[PDB]
Design a protein around this ligand. Structure first.
Ligand SMILES: COC(=O)C1=C(C)CC(=O)c2c1cc1c(c2O)C(=O)c2c(O)cccc2C1=O
Ligand SMILES: COC(=O)C1=C(C)CC(=O)c2c1cc1c(c2O)C(=O)c2c(O)cccc2C1=O
Ligand SMILES: COC(=O)C1=C(C)CC(=O)c2c1cc1c(c2O)C(=O)c2c(O)cccc2C1=O
Ligand SMILES: COC(=O)C1=C(C)CC(=O)c2c1cc1c(c2O)C(=O)c2c(O)cccc2C1=O
Lengths: 141, 143, 141, 140
């Protein structure tokens, strides 16, 4: 049994259920995901929770993250996942298309003090953009 | 309106419903899809109905092709679709993985005599293979 | 003859030659690429120039960006490009892998005052990472 | 591993275009079902015409780079990347002259110490995108 992989699976489950009441259990106070720096200055459990909320709002309550595979090496965990969603919310200046999409993701997680301390994630931006009909942005904001 | 695009949409719906009673309406008697040459020597509506049945049996009755976009140029149609399924039957000598998957597909269809005459399709093999957990074949035959 | 497309082509050639002396001609003073917020607080011609220099340093002097196609819609340009390189510098806490790679990219450019004002780009992260041999990070930094 | 060594020679053959010695590692009953549309050949002769077709269509400078290779019993799985330039006719599409690069997965079955079954999955969609998504001029 890996506590690290268990913790990462709790993180995946949060995106699925949208339930983040217990996020402080597994998200470090100093948690950072550099991928959302454009959108927020938050850190820690608050940052992770708001990103979950963003996924649920932009990609619908039916948005799911399926596990392909998870592995670990020392204090790091790598997760191979697949996002399923429907584009119901505005995203980087693009109006909702209402279109279904699915895309692989890779997530890289560093543990510090038994908690997720750094989180990088790579969506399949181009593949998702294609499935969304390659919308033109209506603004840069 | 385009009759060709309409015919390609009927083709897509046949994969989705598994209903193939009427395939002779839009599939040419000389219909060929070179992608299944390995598995069968069939042609025409017969080939198409078998391939539909293969999809339903292998990727489950819930297997679905969603339309992203379809364009046409003269007697040719190009469809951008996404396949969704669960791997529940043997395929190319790999045992069922039970794995959900989804992958974009490009289809190229040539119309002749008002019917789909040639059909090339490109699954996202590698993308799907990853989602299946990259299974090793148990055999190069049937099994 | 689109001046916007010509400007985006000069931008592409900059990554190719590594020459940034003239970037003020086509990069807006308030130019932003949100993709590099993790790495730098720079803006304008200076931000664009350091990012080109980053590419040449990390993906080698031989790194090339190839044009597949470029379209425009009003004050916006969308470029379909392909990056070729070899991973020779540190990148997000990963040691250099020395690996060749190539990945499609989508770039979205907003023009203001006849210069590039906003720039978003989507590398094929997962495809590239596979070609890199999927390295584990040595640090989060 | 002699199997991995044999698969590396196979990869080298695409790179050099040199097919003189393919009978060394290609089984007399060698099949690649991906080319059934284009030829009825089998064995070393099939493998050799497929390498020639690659050199002809994707240029003499076309090459396969290795990402990783692994094996399980009598099977080898090779993760590769094709680099090429589209200079020859291909499934009814005229040469675009365009550069492209795409990952491939190859699955090889060994029988009697030689490559007997060969399946390969190009990144068709990604390559097609890099080629400008040309429309075919003919089905044949
Ligand atoms: C035009 O859409 C995107 O930029 C996009 C695409 C194509 C694919 C994706 O998977 C995401 C986004 C954008 C995006 C997020 C995506 O996953 C995201 O998770 C995301 C987030 O988790 C928090 C704030 C903003 C976000 C985004 O703007
Ligand atoms: C091991 O998996 C495959 O070969 C495969 C993958 C990775 C992705 C795919 O989309 C397909 C297949 C195999 C396959 C078919 C796929 O779509 C298919 O439609 C298919 C078919 O329609 C009729 C006979 C055989 C078939 C296959 O062997
Ligand atoms: C581990 O690799 C990456 O993070 C990465 C990958 C997989 C693919 C890519 O294309 C890029 C990066 C990272 C990266 C940049 C990539 O293109 C980049 O352009 C980049 C940059 O232009 C300026 C600062 C940092 C950068 C990066 O960290
Ligand atoms: C329109 O392009 C293709 O069909 C194609 C694409 C998009 C990507 C590819 O990698 C290949 C082909 C076509 C193709 C081969 C590709 O790799 C190939 O190796 C190939 C071959 O090895 C022998 C005969 C025909 C072949 C092809 O028609």
């Amino acid at each position: 049994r890996s506590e690290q992989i268990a913790a990462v699976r709790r993180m995946v489950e949060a995106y699925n259920t949208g339930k983040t009441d217990d996020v402080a259990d597994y998200i470090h106070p100093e948690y950072m995901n550099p991928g959302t720096l454009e959108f927020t200055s938050l850190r820690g459990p608050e940052l992770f929770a708001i990103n979950v909320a963003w996924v649920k709002k932009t990609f619908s309550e039916e948005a799911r993250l399926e596990e392909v595979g998870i592995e670990e090496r020392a204090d790091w965990v790598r997760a191979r996942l697949v996002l399923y969603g429907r584009h119901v919310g505005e995203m980087v200046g693009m109006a909702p298309t209402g279109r279904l999409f699915s895309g692989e993701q890779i997530h890289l997680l560093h543990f510090v003090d038994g908690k997720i301390h750094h989180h990088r994630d790579w969506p399949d931006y181009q593949g998702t953009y294609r499935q969304l009909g390659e919308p033109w942005p209506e603004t840069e904001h």
